[PDB]
Amino acid sequence: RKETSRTATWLKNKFAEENITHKLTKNDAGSKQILKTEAANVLDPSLRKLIESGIGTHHAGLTRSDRSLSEDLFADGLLQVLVCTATLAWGVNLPAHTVIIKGTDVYSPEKGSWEQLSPQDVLQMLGRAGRPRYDTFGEGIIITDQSNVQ
Amino acid sequence: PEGSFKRVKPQYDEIHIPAPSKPVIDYELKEITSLPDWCQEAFPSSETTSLNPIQSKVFHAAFEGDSNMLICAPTGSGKTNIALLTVLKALSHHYNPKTKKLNLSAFKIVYIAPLKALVQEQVREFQRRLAFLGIKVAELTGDSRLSRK
Amino acid sequence: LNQEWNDLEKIPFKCTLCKEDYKSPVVTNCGHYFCGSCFAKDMKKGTKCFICHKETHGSAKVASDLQKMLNKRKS
Amino acid sequence: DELYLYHLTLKKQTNFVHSCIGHFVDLEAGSKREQSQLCVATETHLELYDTADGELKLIAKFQNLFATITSMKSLDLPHWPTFLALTSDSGNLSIVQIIMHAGALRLKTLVNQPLTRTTLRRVSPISYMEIDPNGRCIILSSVEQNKLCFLVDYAQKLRISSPLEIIRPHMVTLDMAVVDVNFNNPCFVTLEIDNAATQLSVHLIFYVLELGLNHIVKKADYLVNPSANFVLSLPDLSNPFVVIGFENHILVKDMNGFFSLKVEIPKRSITNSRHKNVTIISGIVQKLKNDFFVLLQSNHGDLFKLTVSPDTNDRNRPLVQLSYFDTIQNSHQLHIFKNGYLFALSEMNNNFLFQFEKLGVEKNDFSNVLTSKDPNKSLVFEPSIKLQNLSILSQQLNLNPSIKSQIVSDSPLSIATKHFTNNKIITLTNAVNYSNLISTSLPPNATKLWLIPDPATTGDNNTLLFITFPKKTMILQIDNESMEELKLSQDTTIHTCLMGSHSIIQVCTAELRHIVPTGKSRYSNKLTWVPPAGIRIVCATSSKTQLIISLSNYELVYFKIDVSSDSLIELTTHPELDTMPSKVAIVQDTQHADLLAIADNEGMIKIMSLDFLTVISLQLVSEKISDMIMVRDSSIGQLNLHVGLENGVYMKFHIGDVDGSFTDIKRRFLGLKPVSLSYLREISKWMSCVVCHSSSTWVSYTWKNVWTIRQLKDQNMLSCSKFVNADVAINGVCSISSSGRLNIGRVSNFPTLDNWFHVHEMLQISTFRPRTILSFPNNPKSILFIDNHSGKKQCRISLQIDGECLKFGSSDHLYKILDDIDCVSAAIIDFTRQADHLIICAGDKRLLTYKILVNKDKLSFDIELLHQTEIISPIHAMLKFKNFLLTAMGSTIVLYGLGKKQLLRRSVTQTPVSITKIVSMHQWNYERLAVGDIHESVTLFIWDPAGNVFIPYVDDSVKRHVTVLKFLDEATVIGADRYGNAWTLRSPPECEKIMSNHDPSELSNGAIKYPLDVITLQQKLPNTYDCKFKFQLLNHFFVNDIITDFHILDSLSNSDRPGCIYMGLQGTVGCFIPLLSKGNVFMMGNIENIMAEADDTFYLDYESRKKNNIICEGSCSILGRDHQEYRSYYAPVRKVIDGDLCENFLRLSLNEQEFLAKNLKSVQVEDIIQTINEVRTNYM
Ligand SMILES: [Zn+2]
Ligand SMILES: [Zn+2]
C-alpha cells in the first residue's frame, strides 16, 4: 500500500520535468471541472493531490467510498493511470488496455522472508489487460530483474 | 513464439513478444434456442444469442455427458457459462419435466475457488443468474458448525 | 476596503423566459438555466445570455442536476 | 480612421550566409557521436541539417530570432556537444547550445557577453569571427578600430575570460582568416588596409595571442601588392604559412619572411566578354594521411587544389602546385566533413553536398600542373562540364535572388517566378499538392463513393469500390493493375460499411441489407431489415462493430453485431426524438463508440450517449446542416465533430468525451454550395484529414496543435476516399471529379506553418539570367518571361498561358531569341483593345516594340517586330496609362501613344526640382499617379486633361529610397526602401476635401482657395512645402529584406480581409493583413507586448526568486535585441503589429505560456492561442 502512493507521486513529479496535462489528462475545458468536483470528495489528502493530476490509487487501506470514486473516474476515462495492489486484480473487474507489473517481490510471513510473485497472481493480474468491448488486443508489461526473466 | 525480438538498452533489456492472431474459426457456435426451455432463461441472449468458441466446443462433452472434464482455457474465457452448463447438466436428472418445479433436497454441487474474495464473486453470479429456479447458493463459513441448517 | 477609483439561491425556479417550471432543463458555460425550448428561442435573436450577456455560443448542456436540485430528493 | 496592419512571414528568407560543422544534438540515438551534422544561418533565420545518411536532411527549424546574425562559428572545446558561437547585431557575443527540451528541439543560450552598441556599425566588433581550432579562444574584429579576443574555458558551467583588446586606429580590415596551431599559442592573420594614406597599400599582418603574458602581440607585418583579396591558413609543414589570393596569382608567405612563393593561377580558354582579373574566393584545407591538399576556388566557379611538397632536389623546401578540379557554381564558404562528403554553400542559390571519389590529378603530371619553380608561366585549360571528381548526392532549392514575380491564381495563391542560376520557371503555391493518375470515365451523375477492404478474399488486396447514383448504384473490384466491375442496384445507397470482420451492411432508403462473403464473387444476404409501416430512412451511420439508422422522423434504431460471430441484434428498444433527424455521425475508427451525434432540420445539433442515452448538449447554428462527420485523432485523443453546412460555411467542434460538451468552435467559409465532407488517413508521422467538397476542395488536417484548412490544386472533387495499391501507394486517394469521372491521385505536400508554400515546376547552369516577368492586361493570367545573356548582349522571351509554356510558331523551341537587344525594363501594353504589344528598352537608348500573337489553338506564340524609337534616358519604369505607355525618363515623365513608323510623344511633364530619377511608378484608375525617386521619397500627381500634363499635389517629409510602390487605395500608398523598410503613406484630409471639391485644371493656375496657414508655409519654407501638403506617415515597419514587389490582393482564398503580399530579394513572401476590428488590434497588441519582453520578465522573476526563496538576460530572445529596437531600426514602427513574434507563443511549453499569460486580466491561454491561430485559417 505504501509503495502505491510512492510510485504514484513519483510519476506525478517525473512528468513535471517534462510534460503533464495533455499527456497526463484530457482537455481542461469541461473535464477539469468534472475532475475538480469529484476530487473534493476524496477522504485521504494524499490522493486529493494525485487524483487532481490524473493519477489514481486503489488499495484496501482506502475506504470503500474512495476506492469506488477512483474507479468511476478511471472507468469514464478521467484518469490515465491507476496504481494498484493485487487487490484490484482479484475481486474488482476493471479492464484497461495496458497493465504493468512493477517488481516481482512479495513478502511471505510463512517463510519470514521475501519471495517472487506467484504465477496464479501474474496470470490473474494480466487478466485485466485489454477491455473486451473496445480494444482488439491487450498488452501486458513486466518489469523485473534479469534472473526473473527466465 | 515467432516474432519475438530483444532490444538491448543501457539500464535494462526488453523482450517484445508479438500478439497472437485470432485462431482458425470453424464448426458452429451453439445457439440459445438449442437449449431445453427450462435452462434457456439462464443465458441472456441479447448480448450473445450464441456461445463463444471456448464454450461452443465443450458443449457436447459437458452438457450432453457425465464424463470427467479437464477444460484448460485462457483467462477471461467465460468459466461462468462453462461450469454452469455442467450445473444445468446435473440439474436435469433431479428436474421434473411434467411439473416445471424441481427437486431441491436431492443434490449438492460444490464449486471450489482458490481465494475467499474470488468466492464471493462466483456466489453473486449463481445467485443472480439461477434465481429463476429457486436454487439457493451460499458460501461455506461452517464455523463451529453453526450454519448446518 | 472598497475602491471606487479602480444558503444563497442564485437559481430562479420559474424561467426567465417561460417564467414557468424548468422542463427539459439546460445549462450553459455560466450557471444559466433554461428550458430546451427557452434557450433555442433566445438564440433566434440574442447572441448572449438573457442575463449575463456573456457568450453562450449556443452551447447548452442537459441540466439534469437542475431536476435533481428541483427534486425534493436532489440527485 | 487609421490603418492597422498585421505582419506575417510566410516563407522565410533563404540566402544562407553562414555555416558550422559540428555535432550539436544527440537525436534518436541513446549514445551516438559523429561530427557529421551542420547548422546553417541567414541573418534572421537559422536551421539544422544532418548528414551521414548520404543526403542532407532537415532536422529542425528554430524560433524566429529577431536580430541580424553577423557571424556563426562552431566552437568545439575540450572536455560534450558543440555549441555554435553566434555574434550578431546587438553587440552581443552569444554562445548558444541547441538542445532538446519538451518534445522539440530548442535553441538555448549560455553566455551573451556585451560588446558596444546595437546596430550594424563599422567600429563594432562583429562580421569577422574566427575561432581557435582547438577551442581555446574566440576572436572577433570590426572593420576599422578594434579587435577583441575572448578566452573560452569550460567548467561546471561554460566560462569566458574578460576580453583581450588591440586597437589600431585607422586600419580597415579585410579577411581575418586564422591559423591552426598545435596548442602552442593561437595566432591569426589579417589583411588590413589603411584608411588614411595617400596611396592604397594593403598589408598582411600576423597576431599572436601570448597565453603566458596574456596579451595580443603583433609579430610580423608585410606589405603586399594592392590586389590582395583573401588569406588562408596552411596547416603545419611538418612559423605558419598563409596562402594569399591576389588577382591573377597566388602567394604563400611565411611569418618570418623566409619564403614568398608565387604561383600564377591558371585560366580558362574562352574568356567570355567581360573578364575580370580572376581572384580566389574560398579555400578550404582538408588533410589526411600525410596528404595535405587544399581546395581553393576562383570567381568563375573553377576549383583548384594545392599541395605543398618538400622539393627534395634543391633542399627540403616548399613546392606549391595549382591543378584543376570539377568546378561548381560559386560558393560563399566551403566545408568538408570527416566523411568524404563535401558541402558547398552557394552564394547565388541552391546549396549542394558533394562526395569526391577521384581526389584529383596526381602531383606527378607536368602537363597540367603548375609549380613554384618559376612563378612566371601560365597554363590554359578547358572547363569540364562532365563533373568527374565530385558527385551531386544532394541539393537544397533556395531562391536567393527573386528579382521580379507575379501572382497567378489569387485564391490558392500561386506565385510565378524564375530561378536565377538555373533559369527555370518556379511556381510557388499554397495548396495541397494533388497528383493525378489513371482517370477513367464513369457514367453520368454520380454522387458519393465508398471503399471497403474486400471481405470475400481474406488475406488479399482485393477491395470493393462503391459508387452511387440517384437512381442506380454501381459496384467495382480492386487489386493491383486489375480494376474490374461486378449488392442492391435498383435503390439509392445512404451508407455502406464493414462490420466486425468478413461482413458488410448496405443501408438503402427503403430497406437495410446485411451481406457476408461466400466463396469469391458471391455474397449472400443473411438478412434484410425493413421499416415497420414502410418509410424512407433519412440517414444512417455506423461504427466498426456498431450501427445506427434514423427513419423518417419518429424513432432511432440501434444495431450491434454479436460477439464471437457475425450477427445484428436490433433494439428493442428504439429511442424517440422531438424533430426530424437530418443527419447522424458516430466515430467509425473504433470497435465501440460512445456519443452519437444527432442533427436536425430545425438547425441545431444534439449529442447522444452510448445511463445509456441522454441528450447531453446543444448547438444552435444558422442554416440547416448539409453534412456531418465525427473523428478522433490519435495524438491528442481529442474527439472532433466536423460539421459541414449548406451555404458554404464549414465548422468544427472539440467534443468532451465524458461530458459531451461543445467547445472550441472553428468556422470557415469555403466556396458557395453545401459542403458534404469526407474522411481519410495520411502522413506528411501518421495523420487524418477531412477533405471538404464545395466549389473547391479543402483538406482540413491538423499538424501538431494547430489545424489548417487549405485548398487543393485540383479544382474540385465531388467525393473522395482512401485507396491502397501497387504501384506503391502511400497517401494515395481515389475520387470522383466534378465532371463525374473516376480518377486516382496522390496527395503530396501539406502546408504546415513551418514551410507553407510548396514549390512546383550533372550540374545545371543557364547562361541567361532572368530579368522581368509580365502579365497580359486583358488575359487575366498568362505570364510572359524575359531574360538576358551574360556575355554578348542577347535576350530570350518565353511565354506561358495556363499550365505549361508554348511552342514558338511551328518551331521546336519553346522560346524566342532576340539578338542585339538587352532589356533594361519591359512592359506589355495594349494600345488598342484587340491586340497586345511588347515594349523593351535597350541599353543603347532605343525603345523597341514587338507584337504578341497567340495562335489559339495550335497553340503557340509569335513575336513580331515593328518600330525602333530613340530615347534620352534609360527608362527604368513604364506602365499602362489610359490608351498609352506612361514611361518615365530619368528626370521627366513622357506619355506615348502608338503611331505608324514609330511611337510618338503624346505628352511630357517636367518634374519638380527634387526628383533625379524615377525608379518606379504606379497609378490609380487613370486619375492619379504615384512616382517614386531614387533618393527622395515619393510624389502624387493628377492627370489633367485639357492641360495635357500632370500637376503634383503632394510630396513627402523624409528621404526614402524606393524600390517599389503601389496604391492600396486612392488616398494612400504602400512602398519599400533599398534598406528594408516597408511603409504606408496617406494623403491628408485637408487635401482630400480640396481634391474632391475641384476640377484638376484649377491646381496649376487659377483659383484654389488655400487656407491662410498653408501659403505662409510656402513663403516660410520654399524648399520643403513646395507642393504644398505632405503625406502623413501611416505605417512603417522594418523587414530586413529588400522588397521587390507588392501584390495587393482583393482576398486570399476567399478570406474577407484583403491582404497585400510582398516578396523580397533574398527570397521571401510576407503579407500585410489589415486588422478590421478595434477589438482584435487591442488583443494582438497585448500579445505582442507579452511576448516582446518575455526574456526580461523571466529574468526579473529569476533575480527576485534568488533574492528571496533563463539565467541570461536574453534567454527568451536568445540574442540581446529588444524587439521594438530591431523592428524599428531606421524609423519607429507605427501601426504594424508583428505577427511573427506572436507566433512564437505557440512554440513555448505550457508552463511558460501560462506564465506569460498571467499578466492579462483578460482571457486564458487557450483563447490567446485561438486568436493567434485565427489569422492563417480565416484571414488567409
Ligand atoms: Zn422555460
Ligand atoms: Zn451568463
Swiss-Prot record, chain A:
Q: List the subcellular locations.
A: Nucleus
The entry's stated outcome for G112R is: Reduces spliceosomal pre-mRNA splicing
> Which Cys pairs are S-S linked?
none
Portion held of the full protein: 747 to 896 of 2163
Free-text function comment from the UniProt entry: RNA helicase that plays an essential role in pre-mRNA splicing as component of the U5 snRNP and U4/U6-U5 tri-snRNP complexes. Involved in spliceosome assembly, activation and disassembly. Mediates changes in the dynamic network of RNA-RNA interactions in the spliceosome. Catalyzes the ATP-dependent unwinding of U4/U6 RNA duplices, an essential step in the assembly of a catalytically active spliceosome.
Please state the gene responsible for encoding this protein. BRR2
Which organism was this protein described from?
Saccharomyces cerevisiae (strain ATCC 204508 / S288c) (Baker's yeast)
Q: Give the comment on domains.
A: Contains two helicase domains. The N-terminal helicase domain has catalytic activity by itself, contrary to the C-terminal helicase domain that may have a regulatory role and enhance the activity of the first helicase domain.
UniProt family annotation: Belongs to the helicase family. SKI2 subfamily.
Outline the subunit composition.
Component of the U4/U6-U5 tri-snRNP complex composed of the U4, U6 and U5 snRNAs and at least PRP3, PRP4, PRP6, PRP8, PRP18, PRP31, PRP38, SNU13, SNU23, SNU66, SNU114, SPP381, SMB1, SMD1, SMD2, SMD3, SMX2, SMX3, LSM2, LSM3, LSM4, LSM5, LSM6, LSM7, LSM8, BRR2 and DIB1. Interaction with PRP8 is important for recruitment to the U4/U6-U5 tri-snRNP complex.
The segment(s) forming the Helicase C-terminal domain are 1-150
What name does this protein carry?
Answer: Pre-mRNA-splicing helicase BRR2
From Swiss-Prot, chain B:
Task: Give compartment(s).
Answer: Nucleus
What is the annotated signal peptide range for this record? none
**Protein residues bound to ATP:** A73, P74, T75, G76, S77, G78, K79, T80
Q: How is the quaternary structure described? A: Component of the U4/U6-U5 tri-snRNP complex composed of the U4, U6 and U5 snRNAs and at least PRP3, PRP4, PRP6, PRP8, PRP18, PRP31, PRP38, SNU13, SNU23, SNU66, SNU114, SPP381, SMB1, SMD1, SMD2, SMD3, SMX2, SMX3, LSM2, LSM3, LSM4, LSM5, LSM6, LSM7, LSM8, BRR2 and DIB1. Interaction with PRP8 is important for recruitment to the U4/U6-U5 tri-snRNP complex.
The UniProt function text for this chain reads:
RNA helicase that plays an essential role in pre-mRNA splicing as component of the U5 snRNP and U4/U6-U5 tri-snRNP complexes. Involved in spliceosome assembly, activation and disassembly. Mediates changes in the dynamic network of RNA-RNA interactions in the spliceosome. Catalyzes the ATP-dependent unwinding of U4/U6 RNA duplices, an essential step in the assembly of a catalytically active spliceosome.
Domains: what does the record tell us?
Contains two helicase domains. The N-terminal helicase domain has catalytic activity by itself, contrary to the C-terminal helicase domain that may have a regulatory role and enhance the activity of the first helicase domain.
> What extra comment accompanies this record?
Present with 1440 molecules/cell in log phase SD medium.
Q: Which family does it belong to?
A: Belongs to the helicase family. SKI2 subfamily.
Recorded protein name is Pre-mRNA-splicing helicase BRR2
Species per Swiss-Prot/TrEMBL record:
Saccharomyces cerevisiae (strain ATCC 204508 / S288c) (Baker's yeast)
Curated annotation (Swiss-Prot), chain C:
Origin: domain of life: Eukaryota
Kindly list the ranges of residues that form RING-type zinc fingers according to the record. Answer: 15-53
Q: Which residues cross the membrane?
A: none
Q: Where, per UniProt, does this protein localize?
A: Nucleus
**What span is annotated as the signal peptide, if there is one?**
none
Name the job this protein performs.
Involved in pre-mRNA splicing.
Note on file? Present with 996 molecules/cell in log phase SD medium.
Q: What binding partners and quaternary form does the record give?
A: Belongs to the CWC complex (or CEF1-associated complex), a spliceosome sub-complex reminiscent of a late-stage spliceosome composed of the U2, U5 and U6 snRNAs and at least BUD13, BUD31, BRR2, CDC40, CEF1, CLF1, CUS1, CWC2, CWC15, CWC21, CWC22, CWC23, CWC24, CWC25, CWC27, ECM2, HSH155, IST3, ISY1, LEA1, MSL1, NTC20, PRP8, PRP9, PRP11, PRP19, PRP21, PRP22, PRP45, PRP46, SLU7, SMB1, SMD1, SMD2, SMD3, SMX2, SMX3, SNT309, SNU114, SPP2, SYF1, SYF2, RSE1 and YJU2.
> What family name appears in the similarity comment?
Belongs to the CWC24 family.
Q: What is this protein called?
A: Pre-mRNA-splicing factor CWC24
Swiss-Prot record, chain D:
Q: Where in the cell is it found?
A: Nucleus
Could you tell me the superkingdom of the organism this chain comes from? Eukaryota
Q: What GO terms fall under cellular component here?
A: nucleus; Prp19 complex; spliceosomal complex; U2 snRNP; U2-type prespliceosome; U2-type spliceosomal complex
- Which interval of the chain is the signal sequence? none
Q: Which gene encodes it?
A: RSE1
Give the protein's biological function. Involved in G2/M transition. Required for pre-mRNA splicing and endoplasmic reticulum (ER) to Golgi secretion pathway. U2 snRNPs associated protein required for the pre-spliceosome assembly. The involvement in ER to Golgi secretion is probably indirect and due to the splicing of the pre-mRNA coding for SAR1, a small GTP-binding protein required for COPII vesicle formation from the ER.
User: Assembly and partners?
Assistant: Belongs to the SF3B complex, a U2 associated sub-complex of the spliceosome. The SF3B complex is composed of at least CUS1, HSH49, HSH155, RDS3 and RSE1.
Q: Identify a single GO molecular function assigned to this protein.
A: U2 snRNA binding
**InterPro entries reported in the protein's UniProt record:** Beta-prop_RSE1/DDB1/CPSF1_1st, Cleavage/polyA-sp_fac_asu_C, RSE1/DDB1/CFT1/CPSF1, WD40/YVTN_repeat-like_dom_sf
Sorted keywords for this record are: mRNA processing, mRNA splicing, Nucleus, Spliceosome
- Does the keyword field hold Transmembrane? no
Entry similarity comment: Belongs to the RSE1 family.
Q: What protein is this chain from?
A: Pre-mRNA-splicing factor RSE1
One Pfam family linked to the record: CPSF_A
Q: Does the keyword Mitochondrion apply?
A: no
The UniProt entry's GO biological process terms, in alphabetical order, are:
mRNA splicing, via spliceosome; spliceosomal complex assembly; U2-type prespliceosome assembly
